[PDB]
Design a protein around this ligand. Sequence first.
Ligand SMILES: O=C(O)[C@@H]1CSc2c(C3CC3)c(Cc3cnc4ccccc4c3)cc(=O)n21
Ligand code: NA
Ligand code: NA
Lengths: 228, 227
Amino acid sequence: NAQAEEFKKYLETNGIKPKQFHKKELIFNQWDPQEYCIFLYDGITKLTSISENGTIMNLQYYKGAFVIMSGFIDTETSVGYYNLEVISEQATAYVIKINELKELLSKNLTHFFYVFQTLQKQVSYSLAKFNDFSINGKLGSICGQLLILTYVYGKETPDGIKITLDNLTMQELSSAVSRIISKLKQEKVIVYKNSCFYVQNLDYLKRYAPKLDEWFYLACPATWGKLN
Amino acid sequence: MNAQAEEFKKYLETNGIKPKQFHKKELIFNQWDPQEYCIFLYDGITKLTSISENGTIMNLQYYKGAFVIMSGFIDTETSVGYYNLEVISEQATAYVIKINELKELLSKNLTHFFYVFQTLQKQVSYSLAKFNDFSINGKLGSICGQLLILTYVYGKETPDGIKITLDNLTMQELAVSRIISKLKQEKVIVYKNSCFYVQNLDYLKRYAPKLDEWFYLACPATWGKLN
Ligand SMILES: O=C(O)[C@@H]1CSc2c(C3CC3)c(Cc3cnc4ccccc4c3)cc(=O)n21
Ligand code: NA
Ligand code: NA
């Protein structure tokens, strides 16, 4: 992306170096009193919360380029007790104290609008998922999640739309969930060929995840028009 | 209400933006509006709805003044999503502003720019907490999460319990009567005077733990008034 590239280089101009992370590493953890603005240039991360019996809660996933912030920008107080785990093999991320963020954006409104419209997407993204889930239950949630893997990591092939994901990432991902995927298999909306995963009926996914499909058209139109 | 909100209100007025009185059931904006707005809900209560192709109305989110609700992207001024913003309180004060004008106002005042930025952070992190509590305790954490918000916001320190202040207009504004019953029975909620009370705030905290954390970090003033 161009906007993200302009932010990458704007960060480096101001002396902020990238930092390579590896799978299962933590970019920041819930006990770090320092609040950060993570610019995940490349890689895949997940935001986890730990209940007080030890159970890890996978709450959200992020793909670079994107912005994650552990503190409110105004008061510089914590958004919550969260960790940012890297689940890809290797992820690049610019780590920035929240204090320095306000200074970088105060000088330049353009990158302020970039970070600002990024949070705008995340808000509407969640509203669109919740919408589809309230209209079609888990069916909408499954089709919506499946629509992500198609619009982003998808590519057109003879056997449909293949998911360009190292199966290391795939299995990173239940009775009712099996029922849904089962029907998708029998209707061949998806497949299991060559150990891969292809999507052949994108129109089906759009039907039961319509609001999320709208979110792409409005927030990621270049990706949306690719497979449309 | 919020120190930042009051100054933002003054800031909008001094730049020639007038408040507008919306009453219950009015739409500050609907989903077929080709103009994208930045709504500053100063006072009142609203909900974000969506009409499907079937014509089915879906509630998606609730907002209470002071708060910001933008329908378009700050940069491209395009819609982030086709939503309607409906008032559900008796009356509501809101400062309707074009998005192109917002871009202008926040550019000359980074302080208010950060404030609007923070209102997005509270939505995102409010959703994550709500999603965690539902992702462990299912609908129990959701209802308890919703009740927890009502308790912290509209509660009263009455020896009877915690008096939900909401005028009846938004109380019953609201498939799972087992949940309301499992709490009606358990001395967790009681409508003594025809009005809801709370006799066990720890039940709600226990099943909405992340929402409780969020409220402790986002509204620490309101959180401690019951703790
Ligand atoms: O199941 C998942 O892993 C995905 C990834 S994150 C996510 C979300 C939102 C972004 C955090 C949602 C939306 C959602 C669904 N149901 C809810 C029920 C109660 C309260 C909030 C909810 C939010 C769905 C989803 O599947 N996933
Ligand atoms: Na933290
Ligand atoms: Na709008």
